[PDB]
Every structure is written in structure tokens, then in C-alpha cells.
Amino acid sequence: CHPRLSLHRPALEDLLLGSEANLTCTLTGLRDASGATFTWTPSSGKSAVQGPPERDLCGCYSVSSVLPGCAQPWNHGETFTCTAAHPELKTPLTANITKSGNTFRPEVHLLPPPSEELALNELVTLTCLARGFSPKDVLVRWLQGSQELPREKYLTWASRQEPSQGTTTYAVTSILRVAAEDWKKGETFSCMVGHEALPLAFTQKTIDRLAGKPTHINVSVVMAEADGTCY
Amino acid sequence: CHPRLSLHRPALEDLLLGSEANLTCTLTGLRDASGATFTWTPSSGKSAVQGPPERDLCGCYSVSSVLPGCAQPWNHGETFTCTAAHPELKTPLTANITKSGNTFRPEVHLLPPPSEELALNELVTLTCLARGFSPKDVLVRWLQGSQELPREKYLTWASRQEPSQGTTTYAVTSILRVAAEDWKKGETFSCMVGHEALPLAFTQKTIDRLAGKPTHINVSVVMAEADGTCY
Amino acid sequence: ERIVLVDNKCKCARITSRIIRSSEDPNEDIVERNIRIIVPLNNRENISDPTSPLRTRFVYHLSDLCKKCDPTEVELDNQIVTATQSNICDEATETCYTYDRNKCYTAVVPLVYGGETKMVETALTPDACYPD
Amino acid sequence: NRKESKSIKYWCLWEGAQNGRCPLLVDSEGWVKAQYEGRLSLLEEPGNGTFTVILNQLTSRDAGFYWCLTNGDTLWRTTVEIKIIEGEPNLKVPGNVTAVLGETLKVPCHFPCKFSSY
Ligand SMILES: *[C@@H]1O[C@H](CO)[C@@H](O[C@@H]2O[C@H](CO)[C@@H](O[C@@H]3O[C@H](CO)[C@@H](O)[C@H](O)[C@@H]3O)[C@H](O)[C@H]2NC(C)=O)[C@H](O)[C@H]1NC(C)=O
Ligand SMILES: *[C@@H]1O[C@H](CO)[C@@H](O)[C@H](O)[C@H]1NC(C)=O
Numbered sequence A, B: 001c002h003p004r005l006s007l008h009r010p011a012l013e014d015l016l017l018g019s020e021a022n023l024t025c026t027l028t029g030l031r032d033a034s035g036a037t038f039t040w041t042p043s044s045g046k047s048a049v050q051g052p053p054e055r056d057l058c059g060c061y062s063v064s065s066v067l068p069g070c071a072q073p074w075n076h077g078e079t080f081t082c083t084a085a086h087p088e089l090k091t092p093l094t095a096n097i098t099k100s101g102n103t104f105r106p107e108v109h110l111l112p113p114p115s116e117e118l119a120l121n122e123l124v125t126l127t128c129l130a131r132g133f134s135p136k137d138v139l140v141r142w143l144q145g146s147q148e149l150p151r152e153k154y155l156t157w158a159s160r161q162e163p164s165q166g167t168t169t170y171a172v173t174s175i176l177r178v179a180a181e182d183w184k185k186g187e188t189f190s191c192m193v194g195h196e197a198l199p200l201a202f203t204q205k206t207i208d209r210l211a212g213k214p215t216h217i218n219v220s221v222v223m224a225e226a227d228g229t230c231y
Numbered sequence C: 001e002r003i004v005l006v007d008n009k010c011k012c013a014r015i016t017s018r019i020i021r022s023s024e025d026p027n028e029d030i031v032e033r034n035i036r037i038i039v040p041l042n043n044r045e046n047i048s049d050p051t052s053p054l055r056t057r058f059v060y061h062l063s064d065l066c067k068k069c070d071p072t073e074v075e076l077d078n079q080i081v082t083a084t085q086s087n088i089c090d091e092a093t094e095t096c097y098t099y100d101r102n103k104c105y106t107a108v109v110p111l112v113y114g115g116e117t118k119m120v121e122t123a124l125t126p127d128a129c130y131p132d
Numbered sequence D: 001n002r003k004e005s006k007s008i009k010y011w012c013l014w015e016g017a018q019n020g021r022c023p024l025l026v027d028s029e030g031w032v033k034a035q036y037e038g039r040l041s042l043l044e045e046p047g048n049g050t051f052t053v054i055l056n057q058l059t060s061r062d063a064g065f066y067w068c069l070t071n072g073d074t075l076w077r078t079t080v081e082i083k084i085i086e087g088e089p090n091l092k093v094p095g096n097v098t099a100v101l102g103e104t105l106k107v108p109c110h111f112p113c114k115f116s117s118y
């Protein structure tokens, strides 16, 4: 076949919640997968591991490496320069990876249940929409009260790019179904979104039934000649 | 590589709107050259025409064949067996595909924009949601008044399954951003959903302003000489 | 009139809400919202003395009254993380319509003492400005 | 209370068996309990409104309600509940070490990269 080289970014779930930002370098398209070479430019804890040469499309071997490290040199803007100088070719090839600039930060919105789900008194739906972020990585969790729900109780879609108003931005969604009775009892729910362009790395919105679109509005304007202190 | 043959159900856009019911028995991965022939079990009155092979992974080919039976005995309950024949591993492969049973209807919701987006005079965003439908085949379109918007103006995700109690069901979302002057003038919008288990095959929802407008407003102007507020 | 959402004392505005489980149609019910504005008829525009005449126009944006921008604490996995709570708090800078019982408001006036002048400091709300 | 900082501080354990009872575990004078030896201390940092108590070597039977007391004029008594959940510690040390008759010892102690800023 044909050899190629790749370098992927560290995953967002272990960069934000933890800090262990391991890297990865992958060459695919070899059938003598013992003679290979990996070299990064910084190596102080230089024990870069290698794994079992797993298969590929139609049973071709594939080698890969992991250089461990944590998140202070990544977020400060360093560079990493993995290279393959294997003897299964007579010329080496190179790649690199850097934290993406030109970022934007998302806008988080929680939407109340629709009006015609509340008649049946069975289960109601809460939608979470996060829009306009320039990298393609995001985290979405849910909380009830102050207790995190387990991940097998909601469904999250993937992140896709939206119709271009000049620059390329992305979007993502998520829904959650809860009981119709305890939404009316007065429980509160939250959608929490994490992305690497936010200043405190996280943001949260909290919704409940009392903080919603009202049916009746009472307005009283009182005119106070007496004082201007507002007790 | 290894030889394998699968066949696919017709597309939903061609089965609901158009008239192009086509089943496609195809095998990809052929140690020999283009020398294959296919026979089908019905003989409705059309020849299963073929196309040339294609380019695939590292020497493998991909032959195909389309059954032109666009008269729809598919939704009456046919069975539509295909059968392969090629100078290959000498045991002729067969496969069987039919219409699914145990169908359910989708439930369509169209949500109003968030108020925070409304109080900024920029583009406002709408959300469509369908959930609870049994096969993962669906079509979502948008409308403004009566004009269908072209499909480069909106983003729609894939169709994934949702966590539930036994009976597997699926869900899908979509969004569309419009201008605030069109919303504030009073132009309406619509989300339209096509599925096979709907009896008239389509559903509509419509939204504008005055959707969740309140029903009662009281204004009280308490004059001077009556200021009697409390802590 | 049951649960307080907003109690703002720069503008002196208060918003409460209550689910009124009404009598007729006993499986549906309304959501009521009460807003109370107290308007001062003798305050200035800036809170100093000679600024501009008395304020005659009062504007209230409910998207600003319901705003929440102080960081909070959230226990996600077995961790404490800090998050924000709003999309719009890119920045005090707000104008206040009334005073507040728990804060001083002072001024500076030059007066003469035979020779030079001084920078005498003057309390505008005398109850809240004792050094204690 | 900030203007009562010249006092002595205490640390309870609410037994709750018959009536309700606070045996002491540690005070600011320099007395610790018997069976809490090597795993309890009371620190006057950060000061100025607050003091700090550290309890390690946890077990599943350390769960309970705990009270903090002073000798001041009017007492707030604050209570905290200690729950024991599943997992493993962040820091990692060996067991208990011996020593030969007079030579150099060396003990390591690990930490992850979440504690690199500290
Ligand atoms: C509302 O009125 C207040 C009170 O007059 C204004 O604050 C004051 O503004 C003046 C002029 O900007 C400041 O005076 C400055 O003093 C420093 C020395 O501290 C000197 O370096 C400058 O040359 C100038 O003389 C004053 O410090 C300031 N603050 C007070 C009195 O606390 C305020 O700007 C007004 N706001 C609006 C929105 O009109
Ligand atoms: C990173 O790679 C790019 C092309 O892949 C090339 O500019 C160079 O090899 C590296 N950049 C720098 C600044 O070294």
C-alpha cells in the first residue's frame, strides 16, 4: 500500500477535568512492523511507549507511540515534532502539532419543555444548545439539584459546522428526559458545557419551572416623594 | 481482500417524494477482474443494469448492480432476494432484505428562540426536534411562509438512538437562524418531517411571535400619600 | 408572591413568582410574576450634588436584572470545578437610581480657613457613615 | 468570630448513642486522643476567621458528624459530615519502613500533574 504519518491532539475530557495531556503519533501501512522510529523534540521523561502493532484496512500492521506530559506546556504554546525515520523507507517524513489559535467561545442555551408535553403527565424533554465555537471539541454534562446524573441517561449528538456567516464556527446539541411530576414539584436541572476557549474553562445554565415564561404579570409602580434610599 | 456482498434498502427521498425505488446488490473486494453476474428472485419486467467497477483500497475493486423495480411492490410485503455469481471462491452468495415491521410514529416539536438572543438585535435561532420513531430513516425540511428554503441554510445532525425501556427508538434535531427584522415583523416559519410510519407521510409545525404571549397584565400606579411598602 | 428571583438595590426593583394551583381545571395551573418599582422623585442623575437636574426618565431591562455573573462551585466527578453562570457579563459601571442603606456616599468640598483652602469631606447619607 | 481569636479550639465526635455526647479528639493546647495517634492535627492557619484540622489514614468507620468548639463568649458550633466513597488516593507512599543500625534512609512520595501548580 502507501505509508502515511499522523499526529493527533490530546482529548478534551482528560485535559479539562484532569491535566494529563498525553500525545500520540501513528504510522500505518507497514508489514514488517518491528523496524520503526519515533522522535519528539522535547523528551525529558523520554520513556515514550510503543504498543502492539494492531491491524488496519485488510490486515496491514500499524505502529504508534505515546509521549506522556501534562497541560502547562500545551496551553502555553509549545510545539511537538514527531518524526519517522524507519528503515522500511530510505527517506524520513515529519509532522507537527500545536494548540489552535483564532478561537471563539460558545453560547450556551437551555430550553424549557414544550407546552404539549405537559398535558400527558408522563415524561418531559429538556434541550441544550451550544453554538459558535471555533475548535471542534466540547464537553456536555447534566446535573439534577447538585447531583451529577450518570452518562447513560441522556443522548448527545456530534459537533458539526454551521452555515458560514464569514468565519467557520460549530454547534452541538443534547437532550434529557425526566419525570413529569418532579418537574412540577420544583426540582432544578442544569446543563454544563466545557470548552478550551472559555476563561474559567466552564460555564453553566440552570433552569426550573418558576423561572419561566409567565401567564399572569402584575406590575405596581410606586412614587416616593419621601426618600431615595430603598430599604 | 476478503469478498463480501451486501444490499441496501431504497432511499427515503426517492421513496416519499420521487419515483426511484432502486435496490442495489453489490460486492466489493474481488481477487479477479470484472467478470461478475447477478440474478434476482423476482422477474417483474426489468433487467438489472450494471455499472463499471470503481477504485478501492490497494487493488480491490467494487462491482454493483441496480434493480430498476421502481413500481413499489416493496411496501406490500415482498422479499427481494439477490444472488451472486463470479469466478471467485466457488460458493454463490445470497442475501435477503425486506420492509421492517414494529413501526412507531415520530413526535415533532418546534421550540421558540431564547429571550437572551431576542434582546440583542442579531440573528435568532430556532430548533426542531423529532423523537420516538422506530426505523432510523427520516427527512427534515424547513419553510418560510410557503417557500421552501434551500438546504444550504440550515444544519441537521444524524439520527441516533436514545436510552429507553426496551423498545428501541431514535431521535434527530436541526436548527435554522433567521434575521430579527423578519421575526419581529411577523413572518412565520415551519419545520416539516417525513417518515414511513406516518399515514400521510408528513407533519408540520409552525411558529412566530405571540406564541407564549401572556393572557393577563395588571398595571397599578400607586400615587403619593399612600407609600406603604414593607421589608 | 412566594419566591424571590431578583432583589436589586441599585435600581430598587424586586421580582417574585408563584405557581398558583388554580381551582377550575384542576390539572392545569398558572404562573404568576410580580414586579415592584419604587421611583424616587428627588434624586439626581449622577450621585453628586450639582450634576444635572433631577432624573425624570427611568429605564429597566429585565435581561440585566436577572443577570448572574459571580463564579460558582460545581462537583462534577469527584472534584470541585469553578464555572461562570452567564453569557453576557463583559464589563462599577452601572448607574444607580436610589441609594442603599448599607453603603456610604461622600463628597469633597473646598472651604477657606483664613489662609489657604482645604479638601473637606462631607457625608451625603449620615446614618451609614460612622467609622465602626 | 474574629475578635475572639485569643481562645482555645476543640474538635468533637458526635456519638449519638444514648443521649448525645462530644468526647474530644484534639485541642489547641497540645492534647490528642489515644487511638488517633499519628493521624490528627489542628492548625491555626489560615487564621483571622478560620482554623484547620487534618485527618488522614481514613477507614469506612470514620463516617460521622463532627463539631468544632471554642472557649469564647457566644459559641457558634458548626457541624460537618464525612462520607466515605470509593476510589484510591492521589498521593502514593509505601508501607512502613525499617532501618539498619545507623545508615541513610530514603523515602519517595508521588503526585499527579493536577498538583504541579501547588
Ligand atoms: C459622578 O460624579 C463623581 C463625583 O464627582 C465622579 O467621580 C469623580 O470624578 C472626578 C473627575 O474625573 C475625579 O477627580 C479626579 O481626582 C484625582 C485625584 O484623586 C485627580 O488626579 C484628577 O485630575 C481629578 O481631579 C474624582 O476622583 C472622582 N471620584 C470621586 C469624587 O469619588 C464620577 O466620574 C461621575 N460619574 C459619571 C458617570 O458622571
Ligand atoms: C510544522 O510543519 C509545517 C508543515 O507541516 C512546517 O511549517 C514546519 O515543518 C513546521 N513549522 C515550524 C514553525 O517549524
Ligand SMILES: *[C@@H]1O[C@H](CO)[C@@H](O)[C@H](O)[C@H]1NC(C)=O
Pocket (backbone or CB within 6 Å): B079, B081, B095, B096, B097
Ligand atoms: C431471508 O433472510 C433470512 C436471514 O438471512 C434467511 O434465513 C432466509 O432464508 C431469507 N429468505 C429468503 C426467501 O431469501
Ligand SMILES: *[C@@H]1O[C@H](CO)[C@@H](O)[C@H](O)[C@H]1NC(C)=O
Pocket (backbone or CB within 6 Å): D048
Ligand atoms: C483579616 O480579614 C479582614 C477581612 O478580610 C482583612 O481586612 C484583614 O486585613 C485580615 N487580617 C490579616 C492579618 O490578614
Ligand SMILES: *[C@@H]1O[C@H](CO)[C@@H](O)[C@H](O)[C@H]1NC(C)=O
Pocket (backbone or CB within 6 Å): D096
Ligand atoms: C507499621 O509497621 C510497624 C512494623 O511492626 C507496626 O508496628 C505498625 O503498627 C505499623 N503501623 C500501621 C499503621 O500499619
